Short mmCIF file of C-alpha atoms and ligand atoms in Angstrom, two decimals:
data_model
loop_
_atom_site.label_atom_id
_atom_site.label_comp_id
_atom_site.label_asym_id
_atom_site.label_seq_id
_atom_site.Cartn_x
_atom_site.Cartn_y
_atom_site.Cartn_z
CA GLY A 1 -54.16 75.09 -48.32
CA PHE A 2 -53.34 78.15 -46.22
CA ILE A 3 -53.31 78.62 -42.44
CA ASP A 4 -54.64 75.05 -42.06
CA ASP A 5 -51.36 73.90 -43.45
CA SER A 6 -50.67 74.02 -39.70
CA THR A 7 -48.50 71.78 -37.61
CA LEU A 8 -48.42 71.03 -33.88
CA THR A 9 -45.39 69.21 -32.46
CA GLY A 10 -43.49 68.84 -29.23
CA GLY A 11 -41.49 66.51 -27.05
CA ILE A 12 -40.55 65.31 -23.57
CA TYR A 13 -37.00 65.59 -22.34
CA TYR A 14 -35.11 64.13 -19.40
CA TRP A 15 -31.82 65.47 -18.11
CA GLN A 16 -29.68 64.00 -15.34
CA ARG A 17 -26.29 65.53 -14.51
CA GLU A 18 -23.43 65.12 -12.01
CA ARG A 19 -20.49 67.54 -12.30
CA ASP A 20 -17.74 68.25 -9.77
CA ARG A 21 -14.86 70.73 -9.75
CA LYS A 22 -11.47 71.07 -8.06
CA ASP A 23 -11.25 73.73 -5.31
CA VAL A 24 -7.63 74.82 -5.16
CA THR A 25 -8.37 77.03 -2.11
CA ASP A 26 -9.74 74.16 0.03
CA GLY A 27 -7.00 71.58 -0.34
CA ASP A 28 -7.63 70.57 -3.96
CA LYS A 29 -10.95 68.91 -3.05
CA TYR A 30 -13.09 67.99 -6.03
CA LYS A 31 -16.53 69.23 -4.90
CA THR A 32 -20.15 68.91 -6.03
CA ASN A 33 -20.83 71.65 -8.61
CA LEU A 34 -23.94 70.38 -10.42
CA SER A 35 -26.16 67.46 -9.40
CA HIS A 36 -29.79 67.42 -10.54
CA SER A 37 -32.41 65.65 -12.62
CA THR A 38 -34.92 67.81 -14.51
CA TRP A 39 -37.76 67.30 -16.98
CA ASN A 40 -38.64 69.46 -19.98
CA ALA A 41 -41.62 69.30 -22.30
CA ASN A 42 -42.78 71.63 -25.07
CA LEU A 43 -45.59 72.25 -27.58
CA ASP A 44 -45.04 74.10 -30.84
CA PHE A 45 -47.82 75.34 -33.13
CA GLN A 46 -46.88 76.68 -36.57
CA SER A 47 -49.60 77.79 -38.97
CA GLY A 48 -49.68 77.70 -42.73
CA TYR A 49 -49.77 81.00 -44.60
CA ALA A 50 -53.20 82.43 -45.39
CA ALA A 51 -53.18 83.66 -49.00
CA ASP A 52 -49.56 82.45 -48.79
CA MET A 53 -48.83 85.68 -46.87
CA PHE A 54 -49.94 85.65 -43.19
CA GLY A 55 -49.19 83.20 -40.39
CA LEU A 56 -48.95 82.70 -36.63
CA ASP A 57 -46.50 80.74 -34.49
CA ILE A 58 -47.07 80.00 -30.79
CA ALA A 59 -44.99 77.69 -28.61
CA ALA A 60 -44.46 77.09 -24.89
CA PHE A 61 -42.39 74.79 -22.73
CA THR A 62 -42.21 73.81 -19.12
CA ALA A 63 -39.45 72.70 -16.77
CA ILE A 64 -40.18 70.48 -13.77
CA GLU A 65 -37.41 69.62 -11.31
CA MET A 66 -37.27 66.13 -9.87
CA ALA A 67 -34.00 65.88 -7.94
CA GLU A 68 -31.41 68.41 -6.81
CA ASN A 69 -28.42 68.08 -4.52
CA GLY A 70 -28.02 70.65 -1.77
CA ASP A 71 -24.56 71.64 -2.94
CA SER A 72 -25.59 72.09 -6.58
CA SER A 73 -24.87 75.58 -7.91
CA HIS A 74 -27.33 77.63 -9.97
CA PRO A 75 -28.58 78.19 -12.48
CA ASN A 76 -28.21 74.71 -14.09
CA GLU A 77 -29.74 76.09 -17.34
CA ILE A 78 -32.23 73.19 -17.75
CA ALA A 79 -34.62 74.27 -15.02
CA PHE A 80 -35.65 77.91 -14.75
CA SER A 81 -33.42 80.06 -12.62
CA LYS A 82 -35.04 81.30 -9.42
CA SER A 83 -34.26 84.79 -10.75
CA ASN A 84 -36.82 85.58 -13.45
CA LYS A 85 -34.77 88.38 -15.05
CA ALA A 86 -31.18 87.81 -16.16
CA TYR A 87 -29.93 91.09 -14.71
CA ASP A 88 -31.41 90.11 -11.35
CA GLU A 89 -29.49 86.81 -11.27
CA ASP A 90 -28.11 86.09 -7.81
CA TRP A 91 -27.08 82.47 -8.27
CA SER A 92 -29.16 81.09 -5.42
CA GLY A 93 -31.67 78.72 -6.96
CA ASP A 94 -33.60 76.96 -9.67
CA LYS A 95 -37.34 76.45 -10.02
CA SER A 96 -40.11 74.92 -12.13
CA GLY A 97 -42.29 76.86 -14.52
CA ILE A 98 -43.93 77.47 -17.89
CA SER A 99 -42.43 79.82 -20.50
CA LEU A 100 -43.89 81.12 -23.77
CA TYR A 101 -40.86 80.88 -26.09
CA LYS A 102 -42.51 81.61 -29.48
CA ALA A 103 -45.22 84.15 -30.17
CA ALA A 104 -44.88 85.61 -33.63
CA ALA A 105 -46.70 86.86 -36.69
CA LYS A 106 -44.96 85.70 -39.88
CA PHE A 107 -45.24 87.31 -43.31
CA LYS A 108 -44.32 86.43 -46.88
CA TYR A 109 -44.49 88.64 -49.97
CA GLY A 110 -42.58 87.57 -53.06
CA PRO A 111 -38.98 86.82 -52.18
CA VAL A 112 -39.41 88.81 -48.91
CA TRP A 113 -40.30 87.45 -45.46
CA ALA A 114 -40.59 88.79 -41.92
CA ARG A 115 -41.27 87.66 -38.36
CA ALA A 116 -42.20 89.86 -35.42
CA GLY A 117 -42.99 89.13 -31.80
CA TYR A 118 -41.37 86.58 -29.52
CA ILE A 119 -38.92 85.12 -32.02
CA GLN A 120 -35.65 83.36 -32.54
CA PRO A 121 -33.18 84.54 -35.19
CA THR A 122 -33.72 82.45 -38.29
CA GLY A 123 -32.04 84.39 -41.11
CA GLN A 124 -28.47 85.44 -41.93
CA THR A 125 -27.60 87.71 -38.97
CA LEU A 126 -25.14 86.93 -36.17
CA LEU A 127 -27.77 87.20 -33.46
CA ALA A 128 -28.63 83.87 -31.89
CA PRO A 129 -30.43 82.36 -28.89
CA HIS A 130 -28.98 80.24 -26.17
CA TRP A 131 -29.93 76.58 -26.58
CA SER A 132 -30.90 74.25 -23.77
CA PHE A 133 -33.51 71.74 -24.93
CA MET A 134 -35.48 74.84 -26.07
CA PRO A 135 -34.10 78.13 -27.39
CA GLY A 136 -34.10 81.59 -25.91
CA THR A 137 -36.50 84.27 -27.12
CA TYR A 138 -36.01 87.80 -28.44
CA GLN A 139 -38.64 90.51 -28.51
CA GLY A 140 -38.22 92.17 -31.89
CA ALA A 141 -38.53 91.42 -35.58
CA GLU A 142 -36.56 90.07 -38.50
CA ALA A 143 -37.05 90.61 -42.24
CA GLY A 144 -35.06 89.09 -45.11
CA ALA A 145 -35.09 88.08 -48.77
CA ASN A 146 -33.97 85.13 -50.89
CA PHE A 147 -32.93 85.63 -54.53
CA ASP A 148 -32.27 82.50 -56.57
CA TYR A 149 -30.06 82.87 -59.64
CA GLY A 150 -30.20 79.21 -60.66
CA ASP A 151 -26.76 77.82 -61.41
CA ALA A 152 -25.30 81.29 -60.86
CA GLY A 153 -25.99 80.76 -57.13
CA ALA A 154 -28.46 82.01 -54.56
CA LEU A 155 -28.34 85.09 -52.36
CA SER A 156 -30.10 85.65 -49.06
CA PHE A 157 -29.77 88.45 -46.52
CA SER A 158 -31.73 89.53 -43.47
CA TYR A 159 -32.03 92.15 -40.76
CA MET A 160 -33.06 91.66 -37.13
CA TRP A 161 -33.79 94.28 -34.45
CA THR A 162 -34.46 93.49 -30.78
CA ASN A 163 -34.81 95.29 -27.44
CA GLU A 164 -35.35 92.45 -24.91
CA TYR A 165 -34.28 88.83 -24.44
CA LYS A 166 -34.87 85.82 -22.20
CA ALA A 167 -32.64 82.74 -22.07
CA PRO A 168 -34.45 79.38 -21.92
CA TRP A 169 -33.73 79.33 -18.17
CA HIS A 170 -35.45 82.67 -17.51
CA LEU A 171 -39.17 83.08 -17.08
CA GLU A 172 -39.14 86.77 -18.03
CA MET A 173 -37.51 89.07 -20.55
CA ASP A 174 -34.96 91.70 -19.55
CA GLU A 175 -33.59 94.75 -21.35
CA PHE A 176 -29.92 95.11 -22.40
CA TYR A 177 -27.11 96.70 -20.36
CA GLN A 178 -23.39 97.40 -20.54
CA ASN A 179 -20.99 95.40 -18.38
CA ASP A 180 -21.99 97.48 -15.30
CA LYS A 181 -25.60 96.14 -15.44
CA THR A 182 -26.90 99.74 -15.33
CA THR A 183 -25.85 101.72 -18.43
CA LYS A 184 -28.64 101.06 -20.90
CA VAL A 185 -28.17 99.38 -24.29
CA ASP A 186 -31.29 100.46 -26.18
CA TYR A 187 -31.33 97.65 -28.77
CA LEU A 188 -29.29 94.98 -30.52
CA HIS A 189 -29.44 94.71 -34.29
CA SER A 190 -27.66 92.83 -37.02
CA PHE A 191 -27.52 92.53 -40.80
CA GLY A 192 -25.95 89.56 -42.60
CA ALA A 193 -26.03 87.68 -45.89
CA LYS A 194 -25.12 84.41 -47.55
CA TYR A 195 -24.00 83.48 -51.05
CA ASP A 196 -24.33 79.86 -52.19
CA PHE A 197 -22.38 79.46 -55.45
CA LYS A 198 -24.03 76.02 -56.02
CA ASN A 199 -20.54 74.52 -56.52
CA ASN A 200 -20.22 73.60 -52.79
CA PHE A 201 -18.59 76.98 -52.06
CA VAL A 202 -20.64 79.15 -49.68
CA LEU A 203 -19.87 82.59 -48.28
CA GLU A 204 -21.59 84.08 -45.23
CA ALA A 205 -20.89 87.23 -43.25
CA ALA A 206 -22.74 89.64 -40.95
CA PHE A 207 -22.36 92.80 -38.88
CA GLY A 208 -23.97 93.41 -35.51
CA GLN A 209 -24.20 96.13 -32.89
CA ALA A 210 -25.29 96.69 -29.34
CA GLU A 211 -26.48 100.30 -29.33
CA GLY A 212 -23.71 102.64 -28.22
CA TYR A 213 -21.56 99.82 -26.94
CA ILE A 214 -20.33 96.98 -29.19
CA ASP A 215 -19.70 96.27 -32.90
CA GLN A 216 -19.64 92.57 -33.82
CA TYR A 217 -18.44 90.81 -36.98
CA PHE A 218 -18.94 87.39 -38.58
CA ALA A 219 -17.47 85.72 -41.70
CA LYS A 220 -17.38 82.10 -42.92
CA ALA A 221 -16.03 80.33 -46.02
CA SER A 222 -17.29 76.76 -46.61
CA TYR A 223 -16.20 74.14 -49.13
CA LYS A 224 -17.08 70.51 -49.80
CA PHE A 225 -15.11 68.24 -52.07
CA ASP A 226 -15.20 64.50 -52.57
CA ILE A 227 -12.29 62.29 -51.59
CA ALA A 228 -12.77 58.60 -52.29
CA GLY A 229 -16.41 59.33 -53.15
CA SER A 230 -17.12 60.82 -49.69
CA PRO A 231 -17.41 64.52 -48.81
CA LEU A 232 -14.61 66.17 -46.90
CA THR A 233 -16.13 69.39 -45.53
CA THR A 234 -13.96 72.39 -44.71
CA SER A 235 -14.44 75.93 -43.50
CA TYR A 236 -12.68 79.00 -42.16
CA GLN A 237 -14.64 81.15 -39.74
CA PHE A 238 -13.89 84.65 -38.42
CA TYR A 239 -15.56 86.16 -35.34
CA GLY A 240 -14.65 89.66 -34.18
CA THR A 241 -15.85 92.26 -31.72
CA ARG A 242 -15.05 95.85 -30.73
CA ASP A 243 -16.42 98.16 -28.06
CA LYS A 244 -16.93 101.92 -27.85
CA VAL A 245 -15.65 102.41 -24.29
CA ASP A 246 -11.84 102.71 -23.93
CA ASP A 247 -11.71 104.69 -20.65
CA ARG A 248 -10.42 101.90 -18.34
CA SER A 249 -13.79 101.76 -16.49
CA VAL A 250 -15.80 98.65 -15.61
CA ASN A 251 -17.41 98.79 -19.03
CA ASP A 252 -14.18 98.67 -21.03
CA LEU A 253 -13.85 95.05 -22.17
CA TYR A 254 -11.44 94.96 -25.14
CA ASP A 255 -8.35 96.85 -26.28
CA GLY A 256 -8.56 97.01 -30.07
CA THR A 257 -10.54 94.43 -32.04
CA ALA A 258 -11.01 91.05 -30.34
CA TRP A 259 -11.45 87.97 -32.48
CA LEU A 260 -11.68 84.19 -32.67
CA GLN A 261 -10.53 82.42 -35.83
CA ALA A 262 -11.36 78.79 -36.57
CA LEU A 263 -10.45 76.12 -39.12
CA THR A 264 -12.72 73.11 -39.67
CA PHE A 265 -12.27 69.66 -41.27
CA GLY A 266 -14.83 66.90 -41.29
CA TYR A 267 -14.96 63.55 -43.02
CA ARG A 268 -16.87 60.28 -42.72
CA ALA A 269 -14.52 57.33 -43.11
CA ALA A 270 -15.75 53.94 -44.36
CA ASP A 271 -19.35 55.27 -44.18
CA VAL A 272 -19.23 54.36 -40.49
CA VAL A 273 -17.05 56.84 -38.51
CA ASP A 274 -17.70 60.59 -38.37
CA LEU A 275 -14.34 62.37 -38.11
CA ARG A 276 -13.69 65.86 -36.78
CA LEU A 277 -10.49 67.91 -36.73
CA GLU A 278 -10.88 71.55 -35.64
CA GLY A 279 -8.77 74.38 -34.27
CA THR A 280 -9.30 77.89 -32.91
CA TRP A 281 -7.07 80.96 -32.43
CA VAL A 282 -8.17 83.83 -30.14
CA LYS A 283 -7.06 87.43 -29.57
CA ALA A 284 -8.64 89.30 -26.65
CA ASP A 285 -6.44 92.09 -25.27
CA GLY A 286 -8.01 94.32 -22.63
CA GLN A 287 -9.84 93.98 -19.34
CA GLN A 288 -12.04 90.97 -20.10
CA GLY A 289 -9.28 88.75 -21.50
CA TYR A 290 -11.54 86.32 -23.39
CA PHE A 291 -13.61 86.46 -26.54
CA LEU A 292 -17.41 86.61 -26.53
CA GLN A 293 -19.54 85.86 -29.55
CA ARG A 294 -22.46 87.75 -27.90
CA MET A 295 -22.79 91.54 -27.96
CA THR A 296 -23.72 91.96 -24.32
CA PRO A 297 -21.15 90.90 -21.73
CA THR A 298 -23.38 89.79 -18.83
CA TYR A 299 -24.07 86.09 -18.46
CA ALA A 300 -27.34 85.05 -20.15
CA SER A 301 -28.17 88.57 -21.41
CA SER A 302 -28.05 87.68 -25.12
CA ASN A 303 -26.20 85.37 -27.48
CA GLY A 304 -24.48 85.38 -30.85
CA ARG A 305 -23.80 82.90 -33.60
CA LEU A 306 -20.85 80.56 -33.02
CA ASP A 307 -20.46 77.53 -35.35
CA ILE A 308 -17.75 75.98 -33.09
CA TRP A 309 -18.89 73.61 -30.34
CA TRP A 310 -16.74 70.81 -28.87
CA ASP A 311 -18.81 69.86 -25.76
CA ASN A 312 -15.65 69.64 -23.63
CA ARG A 313 -16.68 72.03 -20.85
CA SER A 314 -14.12 74.80 -21.45
CA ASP A 315 -14.79 77.59 -23.94
CA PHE A 316 -11.07 77.68 -24.90
CA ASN A 317 -11.54 81.41 -25.66
CA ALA A 318 -8.76 83.02 -23.58
CA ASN A 319 -6.65 85.92 -24.81
CA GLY A 320 -3.84 84.15 -26.52
CA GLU A 321 -5.33 80.75 -26.74
CA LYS A 322 -4.74 78.28 -29.52
CA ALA A 323 -6.65 74.99 -29.38
CA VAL A 324 -7.07 71.75 -31.28
CA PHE A 325 -9.88 69.21 -31.17
CA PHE A 326 -10.29 65.74 -32.64
CA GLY A 327 -13.48 63.72 -32.35
CA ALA A 328 -14.61 60.36 -33.72
CA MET A 329 -18.24 59.16 -33.82
CA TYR A 330 -18.46 55.46 -34.65
CA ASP A 331 -21.74 54.22 -36.16
CA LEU A 332 -22.30 50.66 -34.88
CA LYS A 333 -24.61 49.65 -37.76
CA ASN A 334 -22.30 46.90 -39.07
CA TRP A 335 -22.28 45.16 -35.71
CA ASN A 336 -25.98 44.89 -36.48
CA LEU A 337 -26.71 47.53 -33.83
CA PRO A 338 -28.15 50.29 -36.03
CA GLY A 339 -28.88 53.47 -34.14
CA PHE A 340 -26.18 52.83 -31.55
CA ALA A 341 -23.19 55.14 -31.78
CA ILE A 342 -20.13 55.61 -29.61
CA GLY A 343 -17.55 58.36 -29.73
CA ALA A 344 -14.60 60.00 -28.05
CA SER A 345 -13.06 63.45 -28.51
CA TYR A 346 -10.03 65.29 -27.27
CA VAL A 347 -8.91 68.89 -26.89
CA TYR A 348 -5.48 70.38 -26.22
CA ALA A 349 -5.04 74.18 -25.84
CA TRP A 350 -1.91 76.28 -25.20
CA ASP A 351 -0.67 79.89 -25.23
CA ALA A 352 -3.61 81.07 -23.10
CA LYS A 353 -2.93 84.61 -21.90
CA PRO A 354 -4.81 86.56 -19.15
CA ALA A 355 -6.36 90.03 -19.35
CA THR A 356 -3.81 92.67 -20.28
CA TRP A 357 -4.78 94.82 -17.29
CA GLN A 358 -6.75 94.49 -14.06
CA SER A 359 -8.27 97.11 -11.79
CA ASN A 360 -8.43 94.72 -8.81
CA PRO A 361 -5.75 92.11 -9.56
CA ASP A 362 -5.55 89.04 -7.34
CA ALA A 363 -2.60 87.17 -5.88
CA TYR A 364 -2.25 85.09 -9.05
CA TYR A 365 -2.38 87.92 -11.59
CA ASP A 366 0.72 87.72 -13.82
CA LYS A 367 0.29 89.61 -17.08
CA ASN A 368 2.97 87.66 -18.98
CA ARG A 369 1.87 84.19 -17.86
CA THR A 370 0.61 81.54 -20.29
CA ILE A 371 -1.19 78.33 -19.34
CA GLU A 372 -2.59 75.29 -21.16
CA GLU A 373 -5.97 73.56 -21.02
CA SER A 374 -6.90 70.06 -22.17
CA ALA A 375 -9.84 67.67 -22.03
CA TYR A 376 -11.26 64.44 -23.43
CA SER A 377 -14.76 62.99 -23.55
CA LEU A 378 -16.57 59.73 -24.31
CA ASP A 379 -19.95 59.54 -26.02
CA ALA A 380 -22.65 56.85 -26.24
CA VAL A 381 -25.84 57.41 -28.24
CA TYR A 382 -28.90 55.32 -29.06
CA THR A 383 -31.84 56.36 -31.22
CA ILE A 384 -34.92 54.13 -31.34
CA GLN A 385 -35.10 52.79 -34.90
CA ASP A 386 -38.74 51.79 -35.03
CA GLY A 387 -41.96 51.12 -33.16
CA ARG A 388 -44.26 53.33 -31.11
CA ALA A 389 -41.27 55.40 -29.95
CA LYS A 390 -39.30 55.63 -33.20
CA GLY A 391 -37.04 58.68 -32.97
CA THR A 392 -36.63 58.63 -29.17
CA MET A 393 -32.96 59.23 -28.42
CA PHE A 394 -30.91 58.41 -25.32
CA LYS A 395 -27.58 60.09 -24.76
CA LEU A 396 -24.74 59.71 -22.24
CA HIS A 397 -21.77 62.11 -22.27
CA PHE A 398 -18.72 62.05 -20.01
CA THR A 399 -16.09 64.79 -19.78
CA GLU A 400 -12.86 65.15 -17.86
CA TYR A 401 -11.33 68.62 -18.09
CA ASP A 402 -7.90 69.55 -16.69
CA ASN A 403 -6.77 73.16 -16.15
CA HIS A 404 -2.95 72.68 -16.15
CA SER A 405 -2.39 75.46 -13.65
CA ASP A 406 -2.81 75.97 -9.93
CA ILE A 407 -4.80 79.23 -10.42
CA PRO A 408 -8.16 78.89 -8.59
CA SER A 409 -11.33 79.13 -10.66
CA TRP A 410 -12.11 82.48 -12.33
CA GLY A 411 -8.85 83.82 -10.89
CA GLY A 412 -5.44 85.04 -11.95
CA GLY A 413 -6.87 87.29 -14.65
CA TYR A 414 -8.59 84.35 -16.46
CA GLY A 415 -12.22 85.36 -16.00
CA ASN A 416 -13.66 82.56 -18.17
CA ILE A 417 -11.51 79.64 -16.95
CA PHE A 418 -12.50 77.26 -14.14
CA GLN A 419 -10.60 74.46 -12.43
CA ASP A 420 -10.22 70.74 -13.21
CA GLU A 421 -13.50 68.95 -13.70
CA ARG A 422 -15.33 65.67 -14.30
CA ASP A 423 -18.83 65.96 -15.78
CA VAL A 424 -21.45 63.33 -16.62
CA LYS A 425 -24.66 64.07 -18.56
CA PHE A 426 -27.52 61.67 -19.40
CA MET A 427 -30.46 62.92 -21.45
CA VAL A 428 -33.50 61.42 -23.11
CA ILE A 429 -35.24 63.25 -25.97
CA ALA A 430 -38.65 61.98 -27.12
CA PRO A 431 -40.31 63.95 -29.92
CA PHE A 432 -43.95 63.77 -30.94
CA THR A 433 -46.32 65.09 -33.61
CA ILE A 434 -49.95 66.10 -33.03
CA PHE A 435 -50.74 67.36 -36.54
C1 LIG B 1 -51.31 80.27 -24.70
C2 LIG B 1 -49.91 80.35 -24.14
C3 LIG B 1 -49.83 79.64 -22.82
C4 LIG B 1 -48.48 79.72 -22.14
C5 LIG B 1 -48.16 81.11 -21.62
C6 LIG B 1 -47.39 81.05 -20.31
C7 LIG B 1 -47.04 82.38 -19.65
O1 LIG B 1 -45.95 82.89 -20.33
C8 LIG B 1 -45.49 84.05 -19.81
O2 LIG B 1 -46.33 85.14 -20.04
C9 LIG B 1 -45.67 86.05 -19.20
C10 LIG B 1 -46.56 87.14 -18.67
O3 LIG B 1 -47.11 87.73 -19.75
C11 LIG B 1 -44.43 86.61 -19.99
O4 LIG B 1 -43.99 87.78 -19.34
C12 LIG B 1 -44.04 88.92 -20.11
O5 LIG B 1 -44.72 89.98 -19.48
C13 LIG B 1 -44.14 90.44 -18.30
C14 LIG B 1 -44.98 91.57 -17.67
O6 LIG B 1 -46.05 91.04 -17.06
C15 LIG B 1 -42.73 90.96 -18.51
O7 LIG B 1 -42.15 91.31 -17.28
C16 LIG B 1 -41.91 89.86 -19.22
O8 LIG B 1 -40.62 90.29 -19.42
C17 LIG B 1 -42.60 89.33 -20.48
O9 LIG B 1 -41.92 88.22 -20.87
C18 LIG B 1 -43.30 85.59 -20.12
O10 LIG B 1 -42.47 85.90 -21.13
C19 LIG B 1 -44.13 84.35 -20.55
O11 LIG B 1 -43.38 83.21 -20.52
PT1 LIG B 2 -35.51 73.96 -6.52
PT1 LIG B 3 -12.34 100.89 -28.61
PT1 LIG B 4 -12.16 99.31 -24.97
PT1 LIG B 5 -5.05 70.20 -13.38
#
C-alpha cells in the first residue's frame, strides 16, 4: 500500500579511540590527542508514498559520552561539539545530546522526485554530508529525474539548493560564510547527472557553487571488466574548484583552478581477498595550499562528494602531492571463520608543496620545499553471522602515520598536514528493525 509501506529502523553504536601525535616544539613528545569512548544510537522512520506521490521521513540520533581523557582535543566528531554552531567552534569541549537529522517531505510524480526539509543529498550533485555514524543535515531541497532507455542506458540528473547545514557533531544549523567567517554565502547549490550505458561503463559529472564565492566541479568515468571470471573495477575521477576572490585577502584560497585527480583499481583475488590500488594527484596553488572537495572553507561548515577514502589519517591533498595506496582485505571464510576479515593498507606520498604565498609566514615557510608523507594500517573485522544479533559488526583499526619532515603540525605553509601519529579505533555497530 501507500504511506503504511513505512519502515522504522535504527541502531546502537560504540566508539572507543586513542590517538596521539608528535609535538616537534616540545622535544618530539608523542602526546595524547584523542582519547574517549562514546555511544551513538538512532531511529529512522521512512513512510511509504500515499497515492505513490507523498511521503514523510523523520529521524533522530543521540550521542552519550562515557569516557574522556583530560588531554583529549575537541571536537572528536562522534560526540556533539560543545559549540552548537559550526561558526562558533572554539575547540574546547564535547557534550551529549539529541539531534534531529532527517525531517523531510518526499514527492514522486512520474520519473520526477523531490525532497525538501532537513535532508541529505541523495541524487547526482556534488553536495554531500559529513559522515560519522550518522550523516550531517542540510536545510534545503533536491529534485531530480530518472529516464530509462532500456539497453540504450539510463540517465538521471538532479538539483539541490541549501542555505544552512549541521555536521553530525553539531546540535544546530549554521549559515554559510567565506573563509573570514563573516562575509555571507547566501546558499550552496549543485546540478549533476549520471549516464549508465548498461555495458559497465558509467559517466557522472556535476557542477556546484557557493553563492558569490566558489565554483566546484566533479567528473568520474567507471568501468568493470572480467578477468579470470572476476570483476576488475576501474575509474578515473576529477575534482576541481575555483574561487571568485583573487585580491590576496584572507578569503583568497586558490590561484587558478585547484583540482584533485584520482585513478582507481579494485579486484577480488581467489574470491577471498579484496585488493585495492589507488593514486591521487593534486594541484592547489594559492594561499590555502591544499584541495578541498567542499565549497565552504571553514571546518565542518559543509561537505562535498569525494569517492576517495583510504582511512590512513592524512588527507594527502597538499599542493603538489602525488600519492599511492594499496590495501588488502582478507576474508577468513576458508579457515572456517566466516564473517572474520583482516586487512592491511599502505600509503606513500611525495612532491607535496606548500601554499604559494603566505601573509603571515612562519619560521618554516619555504615556498620551494617539497616533503613526503606515508602511513600504513591494520584492520580486523567481525560481523555476527547469525542468531539474535545477526548483522552486529565489531571493528578494530590501527594507523601509524609518519610526516617525513620536522615541520610542526599545521606549520610551514602546510595548513592541512599534522605531525607523526599513531591512532587506534574500536567500534561496534548493531543495527535493528522495528517495522
Ligand atoms: C520528534 C523528533 C524528536 C527529536 C527532536 C530533537 C530536537 O532537535 C532539535 O530541534 C532543534 C530546535 O528546533 C533544532 O534546532 C533548530 O532550530 C533552532 C532555533 O530554535 C535553530 O537555531 C537551529 O539551527 C535549527 O536546527 C535542531 O536542529 C534539532 O536537532
Ligand atoms: Pt564532556
Ligand atoms: Pt579566481
Ligand atoms: Pt583566488
Ligand atoms: Pt616523521
